[PDB]
Design a protein around this motif. Structure first.
Motif, short mmCIF file in Angstrom:
data_model
loop_
_atom_site.label_atom_id
_atom_site.label_comp_id
_atom_site.label_asym_id
_atom_site.label_seq_id
_atom_site.Cartn_x
_atom_site.Cartn_y
_atom_site.Cartn_z
N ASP G 20 4.43 4.94 12.02
CA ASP G 20 3.35 5.25 11.10
C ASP G 20 3.06 4.03 10.25
O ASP G 20 3.90 3.67 9.41
CB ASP G 20 3.71 6.45 10.23
CG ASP G 20 2.52 7.04 9.52
OD1 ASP G 20 2.16 6.53 8.44
OD2 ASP G 20 1.93 8.00 10.04
N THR G 22 1.21 3.63 7.70
CA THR G 22 1.19 3.94 6.28
C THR G 22 2.59 4.00 5.70
O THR G 22 2.80 3.64 4.54
CB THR G 22 0.45 5.25 6.03
OG1 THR G 22 1.38 6.34 6.11
CG2 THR G 22 -0.64 5.45 7.07
N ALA G 23 3.57 4.47 6.49
CA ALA G 23 4.96 4.45 6.05
C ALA G 23 5.47 3.03 5.86
O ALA G 23 6.21 2.78 4.90
CB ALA G 23 5.84 5.19 7.05
N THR G 24 5.11 2.11 6.74
CA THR G 24 5.53 0.72 6.66
C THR G 24 4.64 -0.02 5.66
O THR G 24 3.51 0.39 5.38
CB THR G 24 5.43 0.06 8.04
OG1 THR G 24 6.17 0.83 8.99
CG2 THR G 24 6.04 -1.33 8.03
N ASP G 25 5.17 -1.11 5.11
CA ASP G 25 4.38 -2.00 4.27
C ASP G 25 3.82 -3.19 5.04
O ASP G 25 3.19 -4.06 4.44
CB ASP G 25 5.21 -2.50 3.09
CG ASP G 25 5.48 -1.41 2.07
OD1 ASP G 25 6.65 -1.23 1.68
OD2 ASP G 25 4.51 -0.74 1.65
#
Lengths: 226, 150, 191, 225, 50, 40, 50
Positions: G20, G22-25
């Motif tokens: 995902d 969005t979970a990762t930066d």
């Protein structure tokens, strides 16, 4: 003072029960830190010092992690051995012992694996006792020799061959690659490799160029679904 | 058919994915999804954490396997053999396992009466059935309490 | 000589004072996984296999050399080979004597093949009666009828000359294999 | 009061033998294969199975905290020796001094209980400790010496293996009960001269180590008829 | 030697043998010369290493 | 399309946030005793 | 030990796995959660003498 799981007749007359049952870990990598249990046994130390333990990630993944509270409607750490339980044993690592003798008591429960590692055996590899047969010194017409023993010491080559039954790797149907089988990390530079400490930047020259990993080589890198 | 159990098993978890209980209803099979391990990663300042995928995360693509294509009117059969499992008893018990003695006769064993460093024991009679010695212990109970206790 | 091991008890001590016997015999301790696998071999094992379990064992004492030590010219000592010196080797196949292997002690064979093993001296702990040392109040476990005093010279063992060989075989029981593969799921997240 | 589940047995409704004066009748029964009761003791403590001359290669915690340090063990600190196998479970294995219905009991209230004496065979209820005879609160007396002093087995083999009475267990915190740990080893209550020889295992759905009855002898699913 | 397999001790004089209570100074005349041992006969006298 | 399942975690939540995969496949489910026996 | 056969590294998070974004930066949001390694998977990780 004696810490950890211990049993005895008083606070001052105890025996330690470390490392505890194989059903629970004593050291694993948490979300952001290395959590080490109070019942932890260290296979050597890294420069008294920091201990060397396996990464019990497989037990942490299955509700067995350290400081795992269990609640009964009321907040304790002890979990009863409930019917229908499933758990992971402490992983076999590179430096672990291979066997220990199960004491031939009347009854035992799940004594297939010793707490220190390896397999519990009712008839383990037999002990081989070695000594040098003493030889008497000269006795006779010499001037008061007395009873003596000839100075003899033994040397030899002891060769041990162990066979291990090996099981095939379980089949995998993942798309993404399995996690790499990382060689364990050493405190300074690399483990199991002889090198020049003077060419390194770390101050871990106390082991003189040959080092062992700070984390016990634990395997269990490749994962499969449950 | 996942004969080799290659893909994660999600059956037998009490999910509302079951076939209809009457034969007059149409079954809508559930969409397949599973949960895998990962690395917990914080979402910035807020402290909210998401289980981001990791090297240990199992991404299973079912199109990357050999399966059957069945046309209209086709049929396909799967067979399975259960392992030998303990049968479930369909009959109850007419006795209490702790009342398996003779009520007319007292025990030949004795129980403590006065405690201390030199305890004295008294012989059992048939008038005190609550202290009858037991051959076998009851089963384990963990948080086996009613909702009124909670 | 056989010695009795009875330290005084009185800071945490054991439940009872420990008592045992120390024998003039040494024993072999090779109860470790790293002794049989080099780091490369262990890497190969954990890479190419999914489970491991001990199957059999063979221990060979070869190149035996009982050596006499005498005074050397100009000081020091010198070493000569003995054709009459013997090595007493006894394999406890029947588990007659107490078993002290497998307790995780600093008695292991060296991890590197270039080092020389110094087998540990054999000793064991046995039962006894805890007796108080009078007014002092300290306690010691004294030997009893139940205390097991084992003399290894009261059994048949092999006398091996210089250059002799002696082999021992052992077959492991069908132990459960140790899984070398992890889990990609949580057992509580199988839904 | 009798219910629908109440089992009323009329033995005259079954076929049986009528034997006249001078008659005879024999019954034969074959015991199922059962674990033999060991008639020999142990000359060692299972927690003292190590070499006393050598310290362990495994270190134990010395300084605690978020970054603990570990110390290698010497040859004189034997209270901290690591153990391969855990001691057997203990359930209310207390003596009468440290212990109406007394001892281990289960029920719905303080006044509505049934005794669980003598408790599991994994624990004793009477043994000779170093200088005194210790009798458990869950002790059964095969007769008495003249109400009076009870007649009990001397469970020295269980006292030798961490199963003695009032054996506390500490979790860093102090309590008597020992949970059944994985890899445990324990001794059963020794068979004695006057002990019962068998007892019927109740045919409940599941059972755990019901091979030996608490009162003595062996647990049998099909005992002598 | 292994520990002796002692017959169990009785409260007064000896067990399992019929004696004259008036011939001894024991205080167990209520058993009328035949006695049970005060400790149950448990065996396990001979010990072996673990 | 294969989708990822990763809700946000912050009242009682799980021990750790969950994650998984939703596949375009449907699967049969007949894990019930009453599906094989009529009441009679 | 031989050098580990490392799975290839990706520009954002990990390759060949559907994550995902969005979970990762990480900044590889254009790939929409499925990524390729920035170094071509080359093998030849285990070495032998000459």
């Amino acid at each position: 003072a004696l810490t950890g799981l211990s049993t005895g007749t008083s606070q001052n007359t105890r025996i330690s029960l470390r490392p505890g049952p194989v059903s629970q870990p004593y050291h694993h990598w948490d979300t952001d830190k290395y959590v080490t249990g109070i019942n932890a046994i260290s296979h050597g130390q890294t420069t008294q010092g920091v201990g060397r333990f396996p990464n019990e990630k497989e037990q942490l993944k299955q509700l067995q992690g350290l400081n795992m509270h269990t609640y009964f409607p009321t907040d304790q750490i002890e979990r009863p051995l409930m019917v229908g339980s499933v758990w992971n044993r402490r992983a076999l690592h590179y430096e672990s012992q291979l066997w220990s003798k199960i004491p031939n008591l009347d009854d035992s429960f799940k004594t297939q694996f010793a707490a220190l590692g390896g397999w519990g055996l009712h008839q383990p590899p037999p002990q081989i006792f070695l000594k040098i047969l003493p030889q008497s010194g000269p006795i006779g017409g010499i001037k008061s020799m007395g009873i003596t023993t000839l100075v003899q010491y033994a040397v030899g080559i002891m060769t041990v061959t162990m066979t291990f039954k090996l099981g095939p790797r379980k089949a995998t149907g993942r798309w993404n690659p399995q996690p790499g089988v990382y060689p364990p990390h050493a405190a300074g530079h690399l483990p199991y490799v002889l090198y020049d400490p003077t060419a390194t930047d770390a101050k871990q020259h106390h082991r003189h160029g040959y080092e062992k990993p700070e984390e016990l080589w634990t395997a269990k890198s490749r994962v499969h679904p449950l | 058919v996942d004969h080799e159990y290659k893909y994660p098993y999600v059956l037998g978890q009490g999910q509302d994915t079951l076939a209809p209980e009457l034969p007059i209803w149409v079954y809508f099979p559930p969409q397949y999804a599973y949960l895998t391990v990962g690395d917990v990663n914080t979402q910035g300042i807020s402290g909210d954490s998401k289980k981001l995928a990791s090297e240990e995360s199992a991404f299973y693509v079912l199109e990357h396997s050999s399966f059957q294509l069945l046309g209209t009117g086709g049929t396909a059969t799967m067979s399975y053999k259960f392992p030998p499992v303990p049968p479930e008893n369909l009959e109850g018990c007419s006795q209490h396992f702790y009342e398996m003695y003779n009520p007319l006769y007292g025990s030949r064993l004795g129980v403590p009466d006065t405690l201390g460093g030199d305890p004295k024991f008294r012989s059992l009679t048939h008038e005190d059935h609550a202290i009858q010695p037991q051959n076998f212990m009851p089963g384990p109970l963990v948080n086996s309490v009613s909702t009124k206790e909670g | 000589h056989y010695k009795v091991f009875s330290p005084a008890a009185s800071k945490v001590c054991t439940i009872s004072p420990i008592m045992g016997y120390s024998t003039p015999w040494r024993y072999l301790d090779f109860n470790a996984l790293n002794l049989f696998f080099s780091p490369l071999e262990f890497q190969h094992l954990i890479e190419n296999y999914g489970s491991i379990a001990p199957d059999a064992l063979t221990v060979t004492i070869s190149e035996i050399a009982v050596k006499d030590v005498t005074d050397k010219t100009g000081g020091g000592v010198q070493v000569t080979d003995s054709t009459t010196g013997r090595l007493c080797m006894l394999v406890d196949h029947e588990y007659k004597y107490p078993y002290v292997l497998g307790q995780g002690q600093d008695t292991l064979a060296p991890e590197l093949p270039i080092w020389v093993y110094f087998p540990p001296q054999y000793a064991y702990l046995t039962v006894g009666d805890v007796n108080t040392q009078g007014i002092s109040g300290d306690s010691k476990k004294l030997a009893s009828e139940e205390s097991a005093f084992y003399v290894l010279e009261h059994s048949s063992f092999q006398l091996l000359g210089t250059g002799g060989t002696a082999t021992m075989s052992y077959k492991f029981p069908p132990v459960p294999p140790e899984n070398l593969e992890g889990c990609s799921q949580h057992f509580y997240e199988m839904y | 009061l009798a219910s629908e589940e109440s089992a009323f047995y009329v033995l005259e409704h079954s076929s049986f033998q009528l034997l006249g004066t001078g008659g005879t009748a024999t019954m034969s029964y074959k015991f199922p294969p059962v674990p033999p009761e060991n008639l020999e003791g142990c000359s060692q403590h299972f927690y003292e199975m190590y070499n006393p001359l050598y310290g362990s290669r495994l270190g134990v915690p010395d300084t605690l905290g978020g970054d603990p340090k570990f110390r290698s063990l010497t040859h004189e600190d034997h209270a901290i020796q690591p153990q391969n196998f855990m001691p057997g479970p203990l359930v209310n294995s207390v003596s009468t001094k440290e212990g109406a219905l007394t001892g281990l009991s289960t029920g719905t209230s303080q006044n509505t209980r049934i005794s669980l004496r003598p408790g599991p065979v994994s624990q004793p209820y009477h043994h000779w400790d170093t200088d005194k005879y210790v009798t458990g609160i869950n002790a059964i007396s095969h007769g008495q010496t003249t109400q009076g002093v009870g007649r009990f087995p001397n469970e020295k083999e269980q006292l030798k293996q961490l199963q003695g009475l009032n054996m506390h267990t500490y979790f860093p915190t102090d309590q008597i009960e020992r949970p059944l740990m994985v890899g445990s080893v324990w001794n059963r209550r020794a068979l004695h001269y006057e002990s019962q020889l068998w007892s019927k295992i109740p045919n409940l759905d599941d059972s755990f180590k019901t091979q030996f009855a608490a009162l003595g002898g062996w647990g049998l699913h099909q005992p002598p008829p």
